[PDB]
Amino acid sequence: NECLGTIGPVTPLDASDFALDIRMPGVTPKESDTYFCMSMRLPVDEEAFVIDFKPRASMDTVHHMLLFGCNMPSSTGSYWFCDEGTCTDKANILYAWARNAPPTRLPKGVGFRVGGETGSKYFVLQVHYGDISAFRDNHKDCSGVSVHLTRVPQPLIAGMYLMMSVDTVIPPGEKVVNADISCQYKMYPMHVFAYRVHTHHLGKVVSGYRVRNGQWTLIGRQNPQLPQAFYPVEHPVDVTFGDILAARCVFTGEGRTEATHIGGTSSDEMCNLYIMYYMEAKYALSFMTCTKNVAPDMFRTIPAEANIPIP
Ligand SMILES: [Cu+2]
Ligand SMILES: [Cu+2]
Ligand code: NI
C-alpha cells in the first residue's frame, strides 16, 4: 500500500475510537527472504481494546505479516532485521496475515486488551518479504497493518494460549521425531476460535487437542509448510478447569547432515501452536503458555490423524 506522509498514522473515528496505521518507514530490501521489523508506541496511555485489523500489503511483494504486543521492542531503530529479534520481553502475537490464506476477522464483542498499567505498550510489526523482483525500481515500501482501537470495554477479551516445545532433538536422517506438549488447564473457561501453527522446514504436521475425561477434541491440525496464518476453529471449543491441552508436531530428520534442536534460526527448529481464544471480560487473562509435557503417557491414545500428513 501507499506511504502515509503528511496525514499521519492516527485517524480519529469517534470520541472513543480511532485507527492506528502501522507501516514500514519506506523500506527497500536488497536480498531474498528478508525479514523487517518496526515498532509503534501506543498513542494513548490508558487501557484500550484492539477490535479489528486491516491488511495494507502490496499484493505482489509480501509473503506474510505479523503483529505483536510487547513492552520492550528489540530495537530503538526506525526499522530492523527481525533475525535480531522481535521483543526482548514476551512478544504477544495479535495478528497474522498470509498471502494464499486470507485471515478471518475477530468476533464482534471480542477485543485484545492493550495499554494501561498491564497491557502491551508497543506494537511490533514483522514483514516477511519474499520475491524481491518488484524492487527493480528501488522504490520505498510502506506495507503493514491498520488497526481499529477503542476505549469502550469489550464484553469478551481475546488472548493467546501458546504451546511450544523446548527440549526437542531431531537426530539426522531420523524418519519420525514426535514433539509432545501437554498441560493441565487451570483458569476460567476459555473459548478457542482460531489457531496458527509454526515449525521450520522440517515439520510435517501439527495438531492440538483438548482432552477431557480421556477424550481428544480436535482444536486444530495443519501442515506447517502451508502459509502459517491464523486459521478459524471449525466448531468453537471450550477449555475448562480440569482439561488437558495436548499438541504434537511431527518432524523428520531426512535432508539433514547434523542433529537439529529448538532455536531461532532457519537451521534450527520450532514447534509452536498458537491457540487464539476469548474469555468473559471479568474472568479474562491475556496470555497462557505450555512448555512442558506433563502427561506424556496420555499420548498413547492420541488420534491417528495427528500422525499422518494432510491430503
Ligand atoms: Cu512468510
Ligand atoms: Cu520459528
Ligand atoms: Ni462454550
UniProtKB/Swiss-Prot annotation:
Cu(2+) 2 binds at residues 198, 200, 270. It is found in: Cytoplasmic vesicle, Secretory vesicle membrane. Changing residue 228 to E/A: Induces a fully open peptidylglycine monooxygenase structure with Cu(2+) distances of 14 Angstroms. Bifunctional enzyme that catalyzes amidation of the C-terminus of proteins. Alpha-amidation is present at the C-terminus of many endocrine hormones and neuropeptides and is required for their activity. C-terminal amidation also takes place in response to protein fragmentation triggered by oxidative stress, promoting degradation of amidated protein fragments by the proteasome. Alpha-amidation involves two sequential reactions, both of which are catalyzed by separate catalytic domains of the enzyme. Disulfide bonds join 3-142, 37-82, 70-87, 183-290, 249-271. The chain holds residues 45 to 355 of 976 of the full protein. This is Peptidylglycine alpha-amidating monooxygenase. In the C-terminal section; belongs to the peptidyl-alpha-hydroxyglycine alpha-amidating lyase family. In the N-terminal section; belongs to the copper type II ascorbate-dependent monooxygenase family. Monomer. Interacts with RASSF9. Cu(2+) 1 binds at residues 63-64, 128. Residues 1-311 are annotated as: Peptidylglycine alpha-hydroxylating monooxygenase.
